[PDB]
Amino acid sequence: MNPIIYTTLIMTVMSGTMLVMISSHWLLIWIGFEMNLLAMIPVLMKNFNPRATEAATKYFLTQATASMMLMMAIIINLLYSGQWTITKMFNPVAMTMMTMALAMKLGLSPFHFWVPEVTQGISLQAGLLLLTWQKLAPLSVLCQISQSINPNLMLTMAMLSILIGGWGGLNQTQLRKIMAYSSIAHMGWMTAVLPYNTTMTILNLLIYITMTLAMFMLLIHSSATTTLSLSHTWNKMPVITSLMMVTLLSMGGLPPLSGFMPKWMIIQEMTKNESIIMPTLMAMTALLNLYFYMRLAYSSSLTMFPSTNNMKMKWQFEHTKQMKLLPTMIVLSTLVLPMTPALSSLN
Amino acid sequence: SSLLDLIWLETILPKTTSFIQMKMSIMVSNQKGLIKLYFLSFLITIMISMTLFN
Amino acid sequence: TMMSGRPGRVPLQFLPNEARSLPPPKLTDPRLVYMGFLGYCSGLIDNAIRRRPVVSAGLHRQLLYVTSFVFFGYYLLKRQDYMYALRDHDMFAYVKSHPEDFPEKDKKTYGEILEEFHPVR
Amino acid sequence: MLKIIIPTTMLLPMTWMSKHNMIWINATVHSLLISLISLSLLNQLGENSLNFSLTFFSDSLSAPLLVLTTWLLPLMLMASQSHLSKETTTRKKLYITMLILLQLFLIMTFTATELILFYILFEATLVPTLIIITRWGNQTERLNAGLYFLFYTLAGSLPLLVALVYIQNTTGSLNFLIIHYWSHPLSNSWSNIFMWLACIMAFMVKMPLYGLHLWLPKAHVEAPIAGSMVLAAVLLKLGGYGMMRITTILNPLTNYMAYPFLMLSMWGMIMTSSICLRQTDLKSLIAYSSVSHMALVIVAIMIQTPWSFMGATALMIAHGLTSSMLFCLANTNYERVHSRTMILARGLQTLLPLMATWWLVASLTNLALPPSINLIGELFIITASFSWSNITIILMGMNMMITALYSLYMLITTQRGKYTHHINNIKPSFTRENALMALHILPLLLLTLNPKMILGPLY
Amino acid sequence: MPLVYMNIIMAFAIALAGLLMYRSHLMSSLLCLEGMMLSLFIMSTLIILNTHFTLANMMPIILLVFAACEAALGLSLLVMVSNTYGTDYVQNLNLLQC
Amino acid sequence: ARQWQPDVEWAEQFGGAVMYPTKETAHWKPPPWNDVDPPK
Amino acid sequence: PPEPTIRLQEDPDPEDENLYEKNPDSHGYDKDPIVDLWNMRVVFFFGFSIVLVLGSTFVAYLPDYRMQEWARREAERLVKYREANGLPLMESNCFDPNKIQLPEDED
Amino acid sequence: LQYGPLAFVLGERTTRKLTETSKVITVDGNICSGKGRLAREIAEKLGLRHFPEAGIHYADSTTGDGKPLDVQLSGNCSLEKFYDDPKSNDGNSYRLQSWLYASRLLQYADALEHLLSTGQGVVLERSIYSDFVFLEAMYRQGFIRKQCVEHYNEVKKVTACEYLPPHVVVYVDVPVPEIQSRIQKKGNPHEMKITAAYLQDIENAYKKTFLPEMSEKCEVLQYSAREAEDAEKVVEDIEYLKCDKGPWPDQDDRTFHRLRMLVQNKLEVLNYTTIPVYLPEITIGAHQSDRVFQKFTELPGRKYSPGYNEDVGDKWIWLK
Ligand SMILES: CCCCCCCCCCCCCCCCCC(=O)OC[C@H](COP(=O)([O-])OCC(O)COP(=O)([O-])OC[C@@H](COC(=O)CCCCCCCCCCCCCCCCC)OC(=O)CCCCCCCCCCCCCCCCC)OC(=O)CCCCCCCCCCCCCCCCC
Ligand SMILES: CCCCCCCCCCCCCCCCC[C@@H](O)O[C@H](CO[C@H](O)CCCCCCCCCCCCCCC)COP(=O)(O)OCC[N+](C)(C)C
Ligand SMILES: CCCCCCCCCCCCCCCCC[C@@H](O)O[C@H](CO[C@H](O)CCCCCCCCCCCCCCC)COP(=O)(O)OCC[N+](C)(C)C
Ligand SMILES: CCCCCCCCCCCCCCCCC[C@@H](O)O[C@H](CO[C@H](O)CCCCCCCCCCCCCCC)COP(=O)(O)OCC[N+](C)(C)C
Ligand SMILES: Nc1ncnc2c1ncn2[C@@H]1O[C@H](COP(=O)(O)OP(=O)(O)O)[C@@H](O)[C@H]1O
């Protein structure tokens, strides 16, 4: 599409998210979600092919259903208290409908099914935007009304999301489905700490976004969407594979990497509330994510796979487009554990 | 050497874990991509959430 | 400790005026040195990804990375220290205003406390 | 303590800015100098400790392990020089970087006044070893080995972390000094039982315990020579150090909770010693012998008496040195024959006599011949166990007999008899290999002159 | 809470369930969404008119407008999907699988 | 004398649509290299 | 079967190189004779001459900070006093009973 | 200002540069025919830019210095061995065919980039289209397997589905016996060993599969040996006909912007020439791959990016 049109659509997506995050009226939050949905579809359908159209249709259906449920919860809450301000829910039925709608918007289990489908359908840039920027608004709304949420339902969905992400990522050879299931598991980790500390939710979101940005930019640079395609990257650009391996180590939560910071803190926070069993199950389940990250690391940099003859031609050329923020993203997603107490900045 | 170290101590912790995780992964990931089944599951979990947490 | 609703909090203010009552971080703070080191690593990785001599390709670029990291790290350290100071201030004020919830326990010495002895055998 | 940490960090820029043909010389020289510097932490006190700062402290349990860790890096460089000769400069520098990072993590792990800092570095050591095994290993099983070596560890280490943060929510601190001074008895409860298990199993899996020891033969057989050296010499001792540190808050529950682990260790030492008798692989045999020795160390720590702790310290140091030497000898054979099967290359005493002498000395010290520090630790642990129960002497004596049996079996199979006829590529041993063996063995026989340096804080 | 509100909410639940069965005809999915918004409009209008909250007389209009815009987008998507297969059957979108 | 590296038969383990092929998922085919299907 | 029975284009596995062939007096460190000799020299000087000898001498003469001689002198003077004054050598109570307040049972 | 979205936004549009003379032309013909001379005459008379036929070292001519690299570092195949031993055990035939197709793709991208950036037309020999005819012959003579042609078809589909075909396809029709006479009169010992069956298969798969397929989306000018000598009538025929049947009349500014971003970024042009499908004739082992890549990196001006190579003579490195 026209670059001016693309810029306008991206700025409309961002303006919808900002309208969600700056408003105090439920109607304006709903309008921000609507604007974001409206401007998101062409971005997903930018590279026109039937797969992207199918993904855009699935995304539109799920997000429109979530918006309808959100409006239903808003109207019930208005019925039981003539309030439009985002604060308390004022009704058990309105809070359940609201949590369901926001979980469907985020992709939390049991509403996770659309995430791998849409992420596989769309390109790598659309998947980057979808898995990073589209979580800011529902999570901000959840952070605002967290004192209303029933901890049982939120914790159930968080544990389900962690389990589903772990088990579903084990079976994947496509990189985009791996990213989708990783996103699902990280959403589960984020929403399990909302009832206790929203600061830890925001910290986990920041760390996850940094790691996901680095991972997607590395995947775009070495333009591979398949495990075997990524196995060829060492014969052209081994440093990219090494950075990818260290980033995958960070994504698995292995200390002393950056990805260890959220889970640790989250576990720490949950122990202050006499919650012991659930963090233990969460860590043991995140071991599965680490396992399939290790499988990818084996396939990418730790061993050298067979190549093809035509690769020699690729040795003679350099990337025309380079990413300005990729080195900063790699360093931030790898080496910020010593700076952990800075989380008091209420990020 | 063979009975305990190579077989049973191997069967208990690592092999059982691998088998369980493999079966769970094969169950969870195997969805035919039919959104009919997805939204039927959505309805079932919606009604369960309404009837279980309040 | 949710301080989001703490009274007299200007909405989008990074560093309030009262934060000026606190000692600023020293320029040789180890955390500032680590932020500069992070900027240096970013410069090295930038050189490596673009297939340039890693250590000696662009000195201006590496200097800019180090300087920007140090700048942001200084302001971040100030905000971090201010938030911890607020936490301690609030905690001490709450303990002072609620004496019945934080009683002064009696001083007992070990010569008058009976602890069970468990032999190691 | 920074006077040791900073030079280790400076080892990295010095490595990466070295010439293509000067990396080994510079790394070896400066690693030896760092070892000499670290040797001045042996001046310990009969009082509390050498509390350098709020972050790092030294102990007479920590100092011998630190000295051994520093001394191991030059030997690892010498051992790795040979099989990495045909390697590119960047990848050799990356290998040396992995070794330096592992040393730095170990040095900070052993001082580490905090239990969370100890946990973080204790798990940070897991990454360079994994890379070394899965990258510069020869066989196709290395990847599998790495997987095992990873997940086993994490299977024990995630519960510990939970327990750790839980403790700080109740005690308010995880500093070793405050933890020791403010220790209170642990009640006989289900919650306390599971807290005890969470505190213990992480260090128990790394010794390794007899039931959980499967990762070790895989990792050692699959790893390169430097990886095997550091796994057998230092990484196995992290569990012993952690157990000795953490069992202070587990009393009196250790009396009841120790029984299953004591039985597992006392029977599995017999089991693994007997396994060594029927082993067709040198590296696998040496790994199983290591499992037996660490079973004895586990018994010592669980008994939890002064003589137990002294014997455990002495045995950990002695086993580290001896097992590293044994792996180096087996690797010298492998670099000639490329087989790693014990029965293949035979009668090597006739072809390599000085290396046969090195084999004899290593077998004698693995056999715990007095007055070696191996036997000092063995005897102290055995006496403590006898006081614990007089029936343990049966299992200890059986273990000693079987240990002598497989040590001399390994010596006789490889060095005695008739040479294999069709093997004609056996070259005279190099000055590098002879010096490597000497630098392993002379420190042991020097340490037997001053045993109190390796007998720990209860001396 | 009167019976009229419960009747409207049960209509909303029926429309949502219909959107959830997916017999076929993504066209029917769009119909179910439109029935859901019709019930939303009716019940919000009743609540706002009952309590004489004069300013929220705005929001049904707003809701209406936005929902219809959504419908337009949805219809467009439908056409393109049909433009690939010649029919709007739900089971045709089985190319991407979990 | 030479460190082992993956060959074709090892790399072909990772070329399927999913890991762990089963009877129900045996018929599944990997997506096209460019994410474009024939219009038929 | 038109296949070459070859799975891929691969380098043949080379034969291991002997350092003693191109250079007798090879010391087993490096294929460059000068670098080889100097690597031998630095290993021997810094490992045997410096660390192994000077470090052993340093450890041998470490000052008595564990206070063994001090403890023996304290014990000697304490025994000398107690023998002369008729006191019963070591006491069974480690702490003075008069500064311990026991809890009354009265059962 | 390297071309991108910003240049398109500010002023850069490629429709204003087209002056009805762009009209990319591609000449064909048999192995030994005067297609190169006719193409060069067309390029000189129309004022267009001539692209000599892509060889083993065409990519070498556009990267670094134009000097060709070693055969083991560039192509790993030879036409002389294909002539001497067409049924070689090392799979030289299909390796040669695939490398040549990749070179054709690179040259077509270069020609499209030149036309879209300057507006001047280009003239080409055998393009990515009609490259398959050799492949077809190699299949019928038994030189390559069916898996080879299947892999070729996959790569050709996924690569050539992204470009605009040439407006004008020029074919020089020369019969097999006179081509063979030209071959013996040439003097090349390796060229001598071509059979008549190979040339017949080339021509047959040539005028029995390539002419109708380009007839429905391009405009084809068939010429014989005698009437290809005079370029004046060929130029007149090219000028007289107007192209309004292909995809070219449907292009506009944003489609041209998409194509111009495509034809740059030669890595993204060559993306699907190395798809992970393992044919023994083209797959290379890890050890050989590592050794050959390390040897390539040690070339004089190849260790770093083009402007950051001190040994070639690049200065001011520490300030770039
Ligand atoms: C605990 C904290 C303390 C320690 C901190 C550690 C981290 C610090 C650094 C962080 C990252 C920054 C640098 C990384 C950029 C990579 C560049 C590179 O490739 O190296 C080539 C470059 C030289 O080669 P070149 O000719 O320019 O170009 C070659 C190409 O780059 C490429 O060469 P090639 O193509 O010929 O070879 C390909 C190779 C190339 O691939 C790589 O080189 C990998 C690069 C490392 C990945 C970086 C990830 C991000 C950071 C992760 C840190 C993890 C730490 C946590 C613990 C986990 C451990 C993994 O890839 C492979 O071979 C694949 C197989 C690799 C095996 C598996 C991968 C494992 C990698 C893990 C490494 C972790 C430590 C790295 C240390 C730095 C290494 C240079 O090396 C350098 O010189 C850079 C080193 C730093 C320079 C220091 C200068 C200062 C000296 C003077 C000042 C003195 C200081 C005191 C002042 C006062 C004195 C008076
Ligand atoms: C994940 C690693 C860090 C990446 C973070 C991005 C780095 C680039 C950002 C550049 C600076 C951004 C600061 C913006 C300038 C002024 C911001 C100010 O106006 O807003 C304040 C807010 O300041 C920011 O929130 C603090 C940002 C600092 C984030 C860094 C902490 C990361 C944790 C430590 C990991 C180590 C990272 C260090 C290396 C980068 C007041 O917000 P307030 O209206 O009152 O409350 C709303 C938010 N609530 C609800 C959560 C309370
Ligand atoms: C596999 C390789 C090695 C791995 C490591 C193995 C070591 C782990 C072994 C765990 C140590 C023992 C666990 C609990 C010990 C407490 C004693 C108790 O079990 O015995 C009786 C307890 O009675 C019964 O045993 C109750 C428990 C029965 C249920 C346990 C399952 C039994 C077999 C399962 C073994 C599987 C272990 C591995 C799990 C993955 C005592 O009677 P009682 O006076 O009433 O209880 C006193 C304790 N109180 C006061 C806290 C209540
Ligand atoms: C080939 C045959 C040999 C030919 C030569 C013939 C001569 C042989 C004589 C040598 C062996 C015979 C044994 C006689 C021992 C004499 C020396 C001994 O008495 O000194 C010991 C001293 O030895 C040292 O204490 C032990 C050596 C130190 C070990 C450190 C290892 C070196 C560092 C390298 C790193 C290794 C890492 C290991 C991890 C821990 C004990 O001294 P001590 O009675 O107490 O008091 C010393 C004097 N004071 C009173 C003033 C304090
Ligand atoms: N796709 C191809 N496959 C095999 N050989 C080719 C291919 N393309 C060109 N060649 C060879 O390149 C040589 C020169 O091409 P040709 O047109 O026959 O001669 P000329 O340059 O005189 O026109 C010929 O020997 C031809 O066989």
CA-nearest of D9, D458, D439, D1 to D233 is D439
Q: How many whole angstroms separate alpha carbon D208 and alpha carbon D298?
A: 9
Q: How many whole angstroms separate alpha carbon A111 and alpha carbon B38?
A: 9
Q: Please name which ligand lies nearest the alpha carbon of H174.
A: 5
Asked if B22 and F20 come within 8 Å (Cβ–Cβ), the reply is yes
Domains in chain F, number: 1
Per DSSP (E only), the strands in chain H are: 25-27, 49-51, 122-124, 168-173, 219-224, 283-284
Q: Which atom of ligand 3 is nearest to the CA of D264?
A: 3
- Candidates D62, D372, D446, D454: which one to mutate for ligand 4, based on the most atoms within 8 Å of Cβ? D446
CB A338 within 8 A of CB C29: no
Q: What is the DSSP letter of A340?
A: G
CB H127 within 8 A of CB H182: no
Distance from CA of G14 to the nearest CA of H (A): 11
Binding residues of H for GTP: 32-36, 83, 97, 104, 126, 131, 134, 138, 186, 191
- Are there at least 3 beta-carbon pairs closer than 8 Å between C and E? no
Facing residue for A249 by CB, picked from D127, D155, D166: D127
Q: How many whole angstroms separate alpha carbon H175 and alpha carbon H33?
A: 10
Q: How many whole angstroms separate alpha carbon A286 and alpha carbon A269?
A: 18
Asked if F6 and A174 come within 8 Å (Cβ–Cβ), the reply is no
Helices E3-21 & E26-50, crossing angle to 10 degrees? 160
C-alpha distances out from residue D139 to D134, D223, D356, Å: 9, 9, 28
Query: Could you tell me which chains touch chain A, where touching means 3 or more CB pairs under 8 A?
Result: B, C, D, E, F, H
Cis upstream peptide for H212 (omega within 30°): no
C-alpha distances out from residue D116 to D71, D141, D160, D242, Å: 27, 33, 10, 12
Chain E residues whose CB is inside 8 A of the B32 CB are: 94, 97
Give rounded-to-5 percent helix, strand, coil for chain D. 75, 0, 25
Asked if F1 and G7 come within 8 Å (Cβ–Cβ), the reply is no
CA angle H73, D135, C42 (to 5 degrees): 80
Which helix (H) or strand (E) covers residue D58, if one does?
strand D57-58
Amino acid (one-letter) located at D121: L
Which helix (H) or strand (E) covers residue D64, if one does?
helix D62-83
Ligand 4 binding pocket includes G6 (Cβ within 6 Å): no
Residue D327 burial (CB < 10 Å; 0-12/13-18/19+)? buried
Q: How many whole angstroms separate alpha carbon D258 and alpha carbon D248?
A: 14
Q: Which atom of ligand 3 is nearest to the CA of D190?
A: 51
Interface of F with A in 8-27 (CB under 8 A): 8, 11, 14-20
Terminal Cα-to-Cα distance of chain D (whole angstroms): 23
Q: How many whole angstroms separate alpha carbon H88 and alpha carbon H81?
A: 8
CB G59 within 8 A of CB D42: yes
Which helix (H) or strand (E) covers residue D51, if one does?
strand D50-51
How would you label E17-45 residue by residue, b for 16+ Cβ within 10 Å and e otherwise?
bbbbebeeebbbbbebbbbbbbbbbbbbb
Q: What φ, ψ does residue E31 adopt, rounded to 5°?
A: -60, -40
Q: What φ, ψ does residue D51 adopt, rounded to 5°?
A: -85, 95
**Would you call G8 an interface residue with chain H, using a CB distance cutoff of 8 Å?**
yes
Interface of D with G in 315-344 (CB under 8 A): 338
Q: How many whole angstroms separate alpha carbon A171 and alpha carbon D164?
A: 34
Closest residue, chain H, to A307 (C-alpha): H284
Q: How many whole angstroms separate alpha carbon D141 and alpha carbon H262?
A: 43
Cis upstream peptide for H189 (omega within 30°): no
Pairing of strands H219-224, H168-173: parallel
Using CA positions, which residue lies closest to atom 14 of ligand 1? C45
H55 alpha carbon, distance to own chain's centre:
8
Q: What φ, ψ does residue D226 adopt, rounded to 5°?
A: -65, -40
Cis upstream peptide for A256 (omega within 30°): yes
Q: How many whole angstroms separate alpha carbon H154 and alpha carbon H132?
A: 12
With a CB cutoff of 8 Å and minimum separation 6, the contacts of D29 are: G42, G46
Terminal Cα-to-Cα distance of chain F (whole angstroms): 54
Q: Which residue ranges make up each domain of chain E?
A: 3-92
| Residues flanking ligand 2, CB < 6 Å | A 202-203, 206-207, 210, 332, 336, 339-340, 342-343, 345-347; C 4, 11-12, 14, 72, 76
How would you label G47-61 residue by residue, b for 16+ Cβ within 10 Å and e otherwise?
beebbbeebbeebee
Ligand 4 binding pocket includes G62 (Cβ within 6 Å): no
Alpha helices, DSSP H, located in D278-372? 282-303, 306-337, 348-351, 353-366
Q: What φ, ψ does residue H123 adopt, rounded to 5°?
A: -125, 135
Cis upstream peptide for H300 (omega within 30°): no
Q: How many whole angstroms separate alpha carbon H101 and alpha carbon H127?
A: 9
Using CA positions, which residue lies closest to atom 21 of ligand 5? H36
Q: Please name which ligand lies nearest the alpha carbon of B11.
A: 3
Q: What φ, ψ does residue D58 adopt, rounded to 5°?
A: -120, 150
Helices A277-297 & A175-191, crossing angle to 10 degrees? 160
Other C-beta atoms closer than 10 Å to the C-beta of A115 total 29
CA angle H260, H261, H266 (to 5 degrees): 100
SS3 at position A125: helix
Q: Which residue has the tokens 């050591």?
A: D125
SS3 at position H127: coil
C-alpha distances out from residue G46 to D29, D103, E25, H163, Å: 7, 19, 82, 67
Q: Which atom of ligand 1 is nearest to the CA of A257?
A: 56
Beta bridge partners of D114: D175
Binding residues of H for ADP: 32, 35, 83, 97, 104, 126, 131, 134, 186, 191
Chain C residues whose CB is inside 8 A of the G102 CB are: 114
| Quoted resolution (Å) | 2.8
CA angle D222, D223, D227 (to 5 degrees): 160
Helices D254-277 & D190-206, crossing angle to 10 degrees? 30
Four-residue CA torsion sign, A153, A156, A158, A160: negative
Q: How many whole angstroms separate alpha carbon H290 and alpha carbon H270?
A: 21
Write down the CATH number for the domain with range E3-92: 1.10.287.3510
Helices D431-447 & D62-83, crossing angle to 10 degrees? 170
Facing residue for A338 by CB, picked from C34, C83, C87: C34
Facing residue for H9 by CB, picked from A3, A306, A313: A3
Beta bridge partners of C26: none
Q: How many whole angstroms separate alpha carbon A282 and alpha carbon A290?
A: 13
Q: What φ, ψ does residue H170 adopt, rounded to 5°?
A: -110, 130
With a CB cutoff of 8 Å and minimum separation 6, the contacts of E40 are: A68, A71, A72, A75, E12, E63, E67
C-alpha distances out from residue H46 to A257, H222, H230, Å: 63, 19, 14
Q: Please name which ligand lies nearest the alpha carbon of H55.
A: 5
Using CA positions, which residue lies closest to atom 39 of ligand 4? D68
Beta bridge partners of A25: A85
CA-nearest of A182, A177, A155 to A166 is A182
D340 alpha carbon, distance to own chain's centre:
22
CB H169 within 8 A of CB H221: yes
CA-nearest of H283, H274, H276, H286 to H90 is H283
Binding residues of H: 30, 32-36, 53, 83, 97, 104, 125-126, 131, 134, 138, 186, 191
Asked if H305 and C56 come within 8 Å (Cβ–Cβ), the reply is no
